[PDB]
Amino acid sequence: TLLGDERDAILAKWNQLQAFWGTGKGYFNNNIDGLVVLVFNKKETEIRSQQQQLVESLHKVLGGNQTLTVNVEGTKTLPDDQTEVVIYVVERSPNGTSRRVPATTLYAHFEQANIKTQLQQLGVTLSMTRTPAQIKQLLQNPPAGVDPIIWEQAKVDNPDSEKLIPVPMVGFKELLRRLKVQDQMTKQHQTRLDIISEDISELQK
Amino acid sequence: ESLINKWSLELEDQERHFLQQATQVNAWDRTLI
Amino acid sequence: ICQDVENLQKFVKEQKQVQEEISRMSSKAMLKVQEDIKALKQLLSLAANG
């Protein structure tokens, strides 16, 4: 029956799986566990022995507040001299709730120049998170299950390539998604604008 | 075929809308940057 | 088959709910912003001219 396939197409249409996704396809341009992997230029035996000290040192880099706790997911010995340590940090809220710091945020903190130098003093040569060129790095090779010819074309179609890269968007909740971010975003804009405003008031006063 | 009909037109109707909304958000993001 | 339409219309409609959900969610917060930065920029010109 011709009848059943229309049904199928329609079912196909309304779905997160992406077979001509309900013709939900839309691409929005996004500007471009909490596990972090650290590589130390130290022997594994040394790392494990000293590890209590090492954990605390990392804690210190964070600021050493009681709220944050460093946890070691595990250690491995990549070369004789180098060891890989994976860690995640738990943060506690004022209401006693606790959750892991996001990998991206944690990574960003470590990457900062001041933090990075301190980390290096520890012997941490390189860091990585599981989640220039690098754009080039991700935008090609395609994403989520998005078709390669469409993904291409969002790249050509992109109105504003440094400020932006093509980011796959997925039907309604995804727009919901975007909006949640927008709001997230909105509050921080408003605030920073307030900070400028306060500094200007101080200067004028 | 009363029903299937209902499906498509609802589908295209919402689709035409979803399209416009995504766009909104695009234009809003727009304005954000 | 008519188990069937009980579900599909149901998953489809479940989805329209989300569509409503986004519809409920809409901006003024956003509109607000350009006005403010346009305004803050101006006070900065003040302070500067001062």
Token pair 């901006």 in the structure block, residue: C27
Token pair, residue A85, equals 């340590």
Smallest Cβ–Cβ distance between B25 and the set A7, A13, A178 belongs to: A178
Q: Which residues pair with A100 in a beta bridge?
A: A90
| Contact across the interface for B18 and C19, Cβ inside 8 Å | yes
Across the B:C interface, residue pairs with CB atoms under 8 Å apart total: 16
Token pair, residue A91, equals 């943060």
Q: Is A193 on the interface with B (CB under 8 A)?
A: no
Spatial CA neighbour of A168 closest among A149, A154, A185: A154
Find, in chain B, the residue whose alpha carbon is nearest to that of A186.
B32
Token pair, residue C24, equals 């409920």
Contact C43, A200 (CB under 8 A): yes
Q: Is C21 on the interface with A (CB under 8 A)?
A: yes
What resolution in angstroms, rounded to 1 decimal? Answer: 35.0
Return left, alpha or beta for A163; rule: phi > 0 is left, psi -120 to 50 is alpha, else beta: alpha
Across the A:B interface, residue pairs with CB atoms under 8 Å apart total: 45
Find, in chain B, the residue whose alpha carbon is nearest to that of C10.
B7
Question: What is the C-alpha to C-alpha distance for residues A88 and A72, in angstroms, rounded to an integer?
Answer: 7
| Contact across the interface for A172 and C22, Cβ inside 8 Å | yes
Which helix or strand (DSSP H or E) is residue B18 part of?
A: helix B2-32
Token pair 């600021």 in the structure block, residue: A63
Contact C22, B21 (CB under 8 A): yes
| Contact across the interface for A178 and B29, Cβ inside 8 Å | yes
Contacts of C27 by beta carbon, 8 Å cutoff, 6+ apart:
A182, B28
Contact A73, A88 (CB under 8 A): yes
| Contact across the interface for B21 and C22, Cβ inside 8 Å | yes
A29: Cα separation from own chain's centroid: 17
Q: Is C14 on the interface with A (CB under 8 A)?
A: no
Return left, alpha or beta for A34; rule: phi > 0 is left, psi -120 to 50 is alpha, else beta: left
**Secondary structure (3-state) at A41:** coil
Give the C-alpha distances (Å, rounded to integers) separating A90 from A26, A40, A99: 36, 22, 6
Which helix or strand (DSSP H or E) is residue A39 part of?
A: strand A36-40
Find, in chain C, the residue whose alpha carbon is nearest to that of A196.
C40
Q: Is A1 on the interface with B (CB under 8 A)?
A: no
